Write a protein that holds these residues in place. Structure first.
Motif, PDB file in Angstrom:
ATOM      1  N   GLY A 206      53.383  33.990  36.967  1.00  0.00           N
ATOM      2  CA  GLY A 206      54.590  33.576  36.196  1.00  0.00           C
ATOM      3  C   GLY A 206      55.649  34.671  36.232  1.00  0.00           C
ATOM      4  N   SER A 207      55.306  35.790  36.844  1.00  0.00           N
ATOM      5  CA  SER A 207      56.196  36.904  36.982  1.00  0.00           C
ATOM      6  C   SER A 207      56.258  37.351  38.434  1.00  0.00           C
ATOM      7  CB  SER A 207      55.751  38.047  36.070  1.00  0.00           C
ATOM      8  OG  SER A 207      55.902  37.676  34.707  1.00  0.00           O
ATOM      9  N   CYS A 208      55.105  37.712  38.981  1.00  0.00           N
ATOM     10  CA  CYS A 208      54.985  38.306  40.298  1.00  0.00           C
ATOM     11  C   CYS A 208      53.898  37.653  41.140  1.00  0.00           C
ATOM     12  CB  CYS A 208      54.544  39.781  40.204  1.00  0.00           C
ATOM     13  SG  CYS A 208      55.272  40.815  38.995  1.00  0.00           S
ATOM     14  N   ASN A 209      54.024  37.812  42.445  1.00  0.00           N
ATOM     15  CA  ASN A 209      52.954  37.518  43.367  1.00  0.00           C
ATOM     16  C   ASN A 209      51.926  38.639  43.323  1.00  0.00           C
ATOM     17  OD1 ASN A 209      54.363  35.140  44.840  1.00  0.00           O
ATOM     18  ND2 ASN A 209      55.836  36.812  44.748  1.00  0.00           N
ATOM     19  N   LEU A 210      50.705  38.304  42.942  1.00  0.00           N
ATOM     20  CA  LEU A 210      49.679  39.309  42.698  1.00  0.00           C
ATOM     21  C   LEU A 210      49.060  39.830  43.993  1.00  0.00           C
ATOM     22  CD1 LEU A 210      47.879  37.623  39.657  1.00  0.00           C
ATOM     23  CD2 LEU A 210      49.810  39.312  39.649  1.00  0.00           C
ATOM     24  N   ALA A 211      48.719  41.121  43.954  1.00  0.00           N
ATOM     25  CA  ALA A 211      48.005  41.773  45.034  1.00  0.00           C
ATOM     26  C   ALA A 211      46.522  41.928  44.691  1.00  0.00           C
ATOM     27  CB  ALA A 211      48.642  43.131  45.370  1.00  0.00           C
ATOM     28  N   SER A 212      46.146  41.547  43.468  1.00  0.00           N
ATOM     29  CA  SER A 212      44.775  41.700  42.979  1.00  0.00           C
ATOM     30  C   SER A 212      43.861  40.479  43.337  1.00  0.00           C
ATOM     31  CB  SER A 212      44.786  41.915  41.465  1.00  0.00           C
ATOM     32  OG  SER A 212      45.267  40.788  40.762  1.00  0.00           O
ATOM     33  N   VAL A 213      42.569  40.737  43.348  1.00  0.00           N
ATOM     34  CA  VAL A 213      41.577  39.779  43.655  1.00  0.00           C
ATOM     35  C   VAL A 213      40.596  39.928  42.491  1.00  0.00           C
ATOM     36  CG1 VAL A 213      39.559  39.412  45.177  1.00  0.00           C
ATOM     37  CG2 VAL A 213      41.845  39.917  46.180  1.00  0.00           C
ATOM     38  N   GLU A 214      40.059  38.816  42.019  1.00  0.00           N
ATOM     39  CA  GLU A 214      38.975  38.906  41.055  1.00  0.00           C
ATOM     40  C   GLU A 214      37.965  37.849  41.424  1.00  0.00           C
ATOM     41  OE1 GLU A 214      41.961  36.990  37.754  1.00  0.00           O
ATOM     42  OE2 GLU A 214      39.925  37.429  37.013  1.00  0.00           O
ATOM     43  N   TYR A 215      36.739  38.030  40.959  1.00  0.00           N
ATOM     44  CA  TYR A 215      35.668  37.153  41.335  1.00  0.00           C
ATOM     45  C   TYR A 215      34.857  36.752  40.123  1.00  0.00           C
ATOM     46  CZ  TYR A 215      32.927  41.465  41.276  1.00  0.00           C
ATOM     47  OH  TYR A 215      32.386  42.680  40.960  1.00  0.00           O
ATOM     48  N   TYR A 216      34.336  35.534  40.212  1.00  0.00           N
ATOM     49  CA  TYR A 216      33.537  34.899  39.197  1.00  0.00           C
ATOM     50  C   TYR A 216      32.041  34.946  39.568  1.00  0.00           C
ATOM     51  CZ  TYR A 216      31.952  31.404  35.958  1.00  0.00           C
ATOM     52  OH  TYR A 216      31.301  30.712  35.005  1.00  0.00           O
ATOM     53  N   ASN A 217      31.222  35.412  38.628  1.00  0.00           N
ATOM     54  CA  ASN A 217      29.766  35.360  38.721  1.00  0.00           C
ATOM     55  C   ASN A 217      29.278  34.216  37.821  1.00  0.00           C
ATOM     56  OD1 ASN A 217      26.972  35.711  38.292  1.00  0.00           O
ATOM     57  ND2 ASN A 217      27.102  37.940  38.571  1.00  0.00           N
ATOM     58  N   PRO A 218      28.956  33.058  38.417  1.00  0.00           N
ATOM     59  CA  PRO A 218      28.479  31.936  37.569  1.00  0.00           C
ATOM     60  C   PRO A 218      27.237  32.216  36.747  1.00  0.00           C
ATOM     61  CG  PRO A 218      28.493  31.327  39.920  1.00  0.00           C
ATOM     62  CD  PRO A 218      29.006  32.718  39.848  1.00  0.00           C
ATOM     63  N   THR A 219      26.407  33.186  37.128  1.00  0.00           N
ATOM     64  CA  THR A 219      25.183  33.432  36.333  1.00  0.00           C
ATOM     65  C   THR A 219      25.445  34.253  35.069  1.00  0.00           C
ATOM     66  OG1 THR A 219      24.317  35.464  37.350  1.00  0.00           O
ATOM     67  CG2 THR A 219      23.853  33.300  38.508  1.00  0.00           C
ATOM     68  N   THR A 220      26.590  34.936  35.014  1.00  0.00           N
ATOM     69  CA  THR A 220      26.990  35.647  33.814  1.00  0.00           C
ATOM     70  C   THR A 220      28.240  35.066  33.165  1.00  0.00           C
ATOM     71  OG1 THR A 220      28.234  37.251  35.092  1.00  0.00           O
ATOM     72  CG2 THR A 220      25.988  37.839  34.545  1.00  0.00           C
ATOM     73  N   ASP A 221      28.859  34.086  33.808  1.00  0.00           N
ATOM     74  CA  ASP A 221      30.111  33.509  33.339  1.00  0.00           C
ATOM     75  C   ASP A 221      31.141  34.598  33.079  1.00  0.00           C
ATOM     76  OD1 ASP A 221      31.834  31.378  32.559  1.00  0.00           O
ATOM     77  OD2 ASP A 221      31.332  31.611  30.459  1.00  0.00           O
ATOM     78  N   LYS A 222      31.227  35.566  33.992  1.00  0.00           N
ATOM     79  CA  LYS A 222      32.193  36.656  33.900  1.00  0.00           C
ATOM     80  C   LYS A 222      33.053  36.804  35.145  1.00  0.00           C
ATOM     81  CE  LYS A 222      30.584  37.921  29.843  1.00  0.00           C
ATOM     82  NZ  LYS A 222      31.397  37.687  28.611  1.00  0.00           N
ATOM     83  N   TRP A 223      34.351  37.089  34.925  1.00  0.00           N
ATOM     84  CA  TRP A 223      35.349  37.419  35.987  1.00  0.00           C
ATOM     85  C   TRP A 223      35.571  38.931  36.046  1.00  0.00           C
ATOM     86  CZ3 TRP A 223      37.673  34.051  39.406  1.00  0.00           C
ATOM     87  CH2 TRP A 223      37.489  32.656  39.149  1.00  0.00           C
ATOM     88  N   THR A 224      35.479  39.487  37.255  1.00  0.00           N
ATOM     89  CA  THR A 224      35.653  40.916  37.496  1.00  0.00           C
ATOM     90  C   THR A 224      36.782  41.151  38.514  1.00  0.00           C
ATOM     91  OG1 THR A 224      33.226  41.280  37.156  1.00  0.00           O
ATOM     92  CG2 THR A 224      34.474  43.138  38.153  1.00  0.00           C
ATOM     93  N   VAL A 225      37.713  42.008  38.147  1.00  0.00           N
ATOM     94  CA  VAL A 225      38.836  42.379  39.033  1.00  0.00           C
ATOM     95  C   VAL A 225      38.401  43.418  40.065  1.00  0.00           C
ATOM     96  CG1 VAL A 225      41.245  43.258  39.101  1.00  0.00           C
ATOM     97  CG2 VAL A 225      40.328  41.899  37.120  1.00  0.00           C
ATOM     98  N   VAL A 226      38.684  43.158  41.322  1.00  0.00           N
ATOM     99  CA  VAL A 226      38.372  44.094  42.389  1.00  0.00           C
ATOM    100  C   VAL A 226      39.359  45.273  42.266  1.00  0.00           C
ATOM    101  CG1 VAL A 226      38.417  44.409  44.919  1.00  0.00           C
ATOM    102  CG2 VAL A 226      37.360  42.332  43.872  1.00  0.00           C
ATOM    103  N   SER A 227      38.837  46.499  42.311  1.00  0.00           N
ATOM    104  CA  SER A 227      39.674  47.674  42.053  1.00  0.00           C
ATOM    105  C   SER A 227      40.713  47.888  43.149  1.00  0.00           C
ATOM    106  CB  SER A 227      38.827  48.933  41.857  1.00  0.00           C
ATOM    107  OG  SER A 227      38.004  49.115  42.985  1.00  0.00           O
ATOM    108  N   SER A 228      40.378  47.629  44.413  1.00  0.00           N
ATOM    109  CA  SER A 228      41.360  47.810  45.490  1.00  0.00           C
ATOM    110  C   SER A 228      42.215  46.555  45.725  1.00  0.00           C
ATOM    111  CB  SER A 228      40.690  48.261  46.796  1.00  0.00           C
ATOM    112  OG  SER A 228      40.315  47.138  47.536  1.00  0.00           O
ATOM    113  N   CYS A 229      43.531  46.753  45.636  1.00  0.00           N
ATOM    114  CA  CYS A 229      44.452  45.647  45.774  1.00  0.00           C
ATOM    115  C   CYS A 229      44.890  45.500  47.237  1.00  0.00           C
ATOM    116  CB  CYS A 229      45.626  45.809  44.791  1.00  0.00           C
ATOM    117  SG  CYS A 229      46.688  47.234  45.149  1.00  0.00           S
ATOM    118  N   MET A 230      45.463  44.341  47.553  1.00  0.00           N
ATOM    119  CA  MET A 230      46.027  44.094  48.874  1.00  0.00           C
ATOM    120  C   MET A 230      47.254  44.952  49.098  1.00  0.00           C
ATOM    121  SD  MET A 230      45.693  39.927  49.233  1.00  0.00           S
ATOM    122  CE  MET A 230      46.535  39.662  47.669  1.00  0.00           C
ATOM    123  N   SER A 231      47.645  45.045  50.356  1.00  0.00           N
ATOM    124  CA  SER A 231      48.816  45.822  50.762  1.00  0.00           C
ATOM    125  C   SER A 231      50.099  45.206  50.221  1.00  0.00           C
ATOM    126  CB  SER A 231      48.888  45.884  52.302  1.00  0.00           C
ATOM    127  OG  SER A 231      49.272  44.617  52.851  1.00  0.00           O
TER     128      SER A 231
END
Ligand code: NA
Length: 286
Positions: free
Chosen positions: A248-273
């Motif tokens: 709603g502001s910017c095009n994100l460079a971040s990636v995050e992933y969902y673990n269905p067995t813990t129902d948790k989303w984790t942001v990957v520390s290294s962003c895209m270029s």
């Protein structure tokens, strides 16, 4: 051993860059840029190739389709689609690449085309019930799902979902999502179909819902860390990765992933270029 490949998109400029994330090294590198600026494309992995299907080059909607050979690190064209098509979804079902819906600058599209790699030909497929721009697609258990989108004629975002059977060549409505989502990221993991984020109007969602074809029902899962519309999705080693998108502001460079067995989303520390929305995402072998 997999590489997640992220292809073109808008930054907000339409771009050519293709980056790959290496899960062992936990870092991104560039590979060969697209032949042309391309955003709002479908993207699939098929027969060892990444196909970038349709989209928008910054001036025009396109019918071109380019394929990437990751062993050669080279892009080459395949047959053009019948129709110029942007904000479409694409998926592989039964060895055929389906290009679903979109927008061509004038109208949204219920039309669907299917590509046969053996004959390098696209052909007409039964249309959807609704014309869906910014639609997300995924295949579960031999059926192809078209999720949400934007109905250009009604000027509204869609909650409805449809399912395509290749034996009968028809689209039928299935259970609706809990909410309207245009630009939902759609992915499949353990035979469940995820619809992540998207938007209804200018506010972007971080909510996520999952569909089970065995129950024909949707249910909520944990919210993402970031609100994301037009993010790319893929499934790697039990985890659902959501790449970029617009918050709603910017095009994100971040990636995050969902673990269905813990129902948790984790942001990957290294962003895209670069930040990217409406980028293609898929997974290849390293
Ligand atoms: Na477009």
């Amino acid at each position: 051993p997999k590489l997640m490949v992220v292809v073109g998109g808008q930054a907000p400029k339409a771009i050519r860059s293709v980056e790959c994330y290496d899960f062992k090294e936990e870092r991104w590198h560039q590979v060969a840029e697209l032949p042309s600026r391309r955003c709002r494309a479908g993207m699939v992995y098929m027969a060892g190739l990444v196909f970038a299907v349709g989209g928008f080059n910054g001036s025009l909607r396109v019918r071109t389709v380019d394929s990437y050979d990751p062993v050669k690190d080279q892009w080459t064209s395949v047959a053009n689609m019948r129709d110029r098509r942007s904000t479409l979804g694409a998926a592989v079902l039964n060895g055929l690449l389906y290009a679903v819906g979109g927008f061509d600058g004038s109208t949204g599209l219920s039309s669907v085309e299917a590509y046969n790699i053996k004959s390098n030909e696209w052909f007409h497929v039964a249309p959807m019930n609704t014309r869906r721009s910014s639609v997300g697609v995924g295949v579960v258990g031999g059926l192809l799902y078209a999720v949400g989108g934007y109905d250009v004629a009604s000027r509204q975002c869609l909650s409805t979902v449809e399912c395509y059977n290749a034996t009968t060549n028809e689209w039928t409505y299935i259970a609706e999502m809990s909410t309207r989502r245009s630009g939902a990221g759609v992915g499949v993991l353990n035979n469940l179909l995820y619809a992540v984020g998207g938007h209804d109007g200018p506010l972007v969602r971080k909510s996520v819902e999952v569909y089970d074809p065995t129950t024909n029902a949707w249910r909520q899962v944990a919210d993402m860390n970031m609100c994301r519309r037009n993010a790319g999705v893929c499934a790697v080693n039990g985890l659902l990765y959501v790449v970029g998108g617009d918050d709603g502001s910017c095009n994100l460079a971040s990636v995050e992933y969902y673990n269905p067995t813990t129902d948790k989303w984790t942001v990957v520390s290294s962003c895209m270029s670069t930040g990217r929305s409406y980028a293609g995402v898929t997974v290849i072998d390293k």
